[PDB]
Amino acid sequence: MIQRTPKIQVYSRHPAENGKSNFLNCYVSGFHPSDIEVDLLKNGERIEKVEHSDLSFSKDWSFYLLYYTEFTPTEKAEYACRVNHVTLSQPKIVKWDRDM
């Protein structure tokens, strides 16, 4: 058996074909087992509609998840990603920094 804690990165991207649009991303990488719970949060509340959830694996024991959706960050509100995994005794919340 192997278990590996996810690395979690939270960032924003504009798709080059539609640069006025902005996407909030949570990239959860290198984890095992694959069982996981991932949410995007706005003011601590689960964003119910997340458009994209892309899961892959490299080696049989390393999984990668890109979880992302369109958003409009203003100076109002706080955004984050929350991850639950067997390796994490408490949920891990990683805040989005507007500079990322």
Swiss-Prot record:
Q: Which sequence positions carry the modification called Pyrrolidone carboxylic acid?
A: Q3
Glycosylation: which residues? I2, K20, K42, K49, K59, K92, K95
Q: Name one GO molecular function term.
A: identical protein binding
Domain Ig-like C1-type: start-end pairs: 6-94
Q: Which GO terms describe its cellular component?
A: cytosol; early endosome lumen; early endosome membrane; endoplasmic reticulum; endoplasmic reticulum lumen; ER to Golgi transport vesicle membrane; external side of plasma membrane; extracellular exosome
Reported modifications of this chain: Glycation of Ile-2 is observed in long-term hemodialysis patients.
Give the location in the cell: Secreted; Cell surface
Q: Which GO terms describe its biological process?
A: amyloid fibril formation; antigen processing and presentation of endogenous peptide antigen via MHC class I; antigen processing and presentation of exogenous peptide antigen via MHC class II; antigen processing and presentation of exogenous protein antigen via MHC class Ib, TAP-dependent; cellular response to iron ion; cellular response to iron(III) ion; cellular response to nicotine; intracellular iron ion homeostasis
Q: Which UniProt keywords apply?
A: Amyloid, Amyloidosis, Disease variant, Disulfide bond, Glycation, Glycoprotein, Immunity, Immunoglobulin domain, MHC I, Pyrrolidone carboxylic acid, Secreted, Signal
Its assembly, as annotated, is: Heterodimer of an alpha chain and a beta chain. Beta-2-microglobulin is the beta-chain of major histocompatibility complex class I molecules. Polymers of beta 2-microglobulin can be found in tissues from patients on long-term hemodialysis. B2M alone (not in complex with HLA-I) interacts with M.tuberculosis EsxA (ESAT-6) and an EsxA-EsxB (CFP-10) complex; the tripartite complex can be detected in the host endoplasmic reticulum. The B2M-EsxA complex can be detected in patients with pleural tuberculosis and is stable from pH 4.0 to 8.0 and in the presence of 2M NaCl.
Q: Give the family per the record.
A: Belongs to the beta-2-microglobulin family.
**Pathological association:** Immunodeficiency 43: A disorder characterized by marked reduction in serum concentrations of immunoglobulins and albumin, and hypoproteinemia due to hypercatabolism. Patients may suffer from recurrent respiratory tract infections and severe skin disease. Amyloidosis, hereditary systemic 6: A form of hereditary systemic amyloidosis, a disorder characterized by amyloid deposition in multiple tissues resulting in a wide clinical spectrum. AMYLD6 is mainly characterized by gastrointestinal and cardiac symptoms. Neurologic involvement, sicca syndrome, and carpal tunnel syndrome may also be present. Inheritance is autosomal dominant.
This chain belongs to which protein, by name? Beta-2-microglobulin
Q: Which organism is it from?
A: Homo sapiens
